[PDB]
Amino acid sequence: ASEALTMIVNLLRSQRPLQEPTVEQMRAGLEAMAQMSPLPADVELTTVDAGGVPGAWVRVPESDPDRVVLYLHGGGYVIGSIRTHRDLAQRIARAARCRVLLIDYRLAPEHPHPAAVEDSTRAYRWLLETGSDPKRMAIAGDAAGGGLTVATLVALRDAGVPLPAAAVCLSPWVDLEGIGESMTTKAAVDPMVQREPLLRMASMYLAGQDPRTPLAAPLYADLRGLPPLLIQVGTAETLLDDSVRLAERARAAGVQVTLEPWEDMIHVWQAFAAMLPEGQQAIERIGEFLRQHWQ
């Protein structure tokens, strides 16, 4: 990997955003880090009420106005915001030449499962109501948002809602128990995600519910009928086996899966694209995948 990877690893080993002692310090810590990679001048951000869920339209000059990604941010269902993920959103808008709807879905512990899935499905239905066509739509998300992407597709399908052209999961979190082999074997090389913080956030999201609740932990969901899925994951991730097990389950359910394991990459390395070449390379691949499925 690029020598730039060492700089991102060094940043993450010091900041330890998921290890902050309180939820508000974790939220503020991630917002502080996101401010390091500020929005280019050509990004247009428009606040919207997405059918009872707050959102922001993210548009760049070459955004096709009729193509939309519903983007579901990461942060363990507990942290993250429009502020933390607007840069990743504009980079995807730029690569996929589309508009991105970045939603502020309800966060735990204040709003446990299933609040996040109620909000993601509400925003998708609102896009349909306001005239977006599923064949020009996609759902994408990182980490918890990657899990939420799969859960949103399952919930939409079960409600007879037409599914979008494709979906993208960046380092998805789909096992809320952290029982994947990589949760032990990649603990030493993962500077951001470990089992203890994951279980802390899972507890806030689940509020005592079964950790294998399908819409909370879509490794246990029925994935039949889902549209083509791109899963991007780093091999230096405790969550590597979340992506491997998701790919196995989706393929067993007849879903078209592309699993891309990026050698030595860390959790949501795409977020560091300003400084990490592999981050921008991975976002270019997301754009290629979406534009292919919108043909």
Q: Which residues neighbour 32 within 8 Å (Cβ) at sequence distance 6 or greater?
A: none
Expressed as residue numbers, the domain containing 257 is 1-295
Q: What are phi and psi of 190, to 5 degrees?
A: -95, 105
Integer-rounded Cα Rg, in Å, for the chain is 17
Q: Which two tokens stand for residue 43?
A: 């990004």
Q: At what angle do helices 82-96 and 23-34 cross, to 10 degrees?
A: 40
The per-residue b/e assignment along 176-210, b for 16 or more CB within 10 angstroms, e otherwise, is bebebebbeebeebbbbbbbebbeebbbbbbeebe
Is the sign of the CA dihedral 117, 122, 123, 128 positive or negative?
A: positive
CB atoms near residue 12 (< 10 Å): 19
Phi, psi of 244 (to 5 degrees): -65, -45
In angstroms, the CA 26 to CA 12 distance is 13
Task: Evaluate whether 125 touches 161 at the Cβ level (below 8 Å).
Answer: yes
The domain tally of the chain equals 1
Alpha carbon dihedral 202, 183, 25, 49, in 10-degree steps, equals: -50
* 146 beta partners: none
Cβ(78)–Cβ(109) below 8 Å: yes
Tell me which residue has tokens 């879905």. 105
CA distance 163 to 154: 9
Cis peptide before 134 (omega within 30 of 0): no
Determine the Cα–Cα distance for residues 279 and 247; give it in Å rounded to an integer: 21
> Among the residues of 97-143, which ranges form H helices?
115-129
**Pairing outcome for strands 54-59 and 44-49:** antiparallel
Please enumerate in sequence order all residues whose Cβ is within 8 A of that of 81, keeping only pairs 6 or more positions apart, or say none. Answer: 27, 31, 73, 75, 104
b/e burial code for range 41-65 (CB count within 10 A of at least 16 → b): eebeeeebebbebbbbbbbbeebee
H or E element, residue 100:
strand 98-103
The Cα 108–Cα 25 span in angstroms is 14
Residue of 156, 132, 141, 137 whose CA lies nearest to 225: 156
DSSP-based three-state secondary structure for 212: coil
Phi, psi of 247 (to 5 degrees): -60, -45
- What phi and psi values does residue 169 have, to the nearest 5 degrees? -120, 120
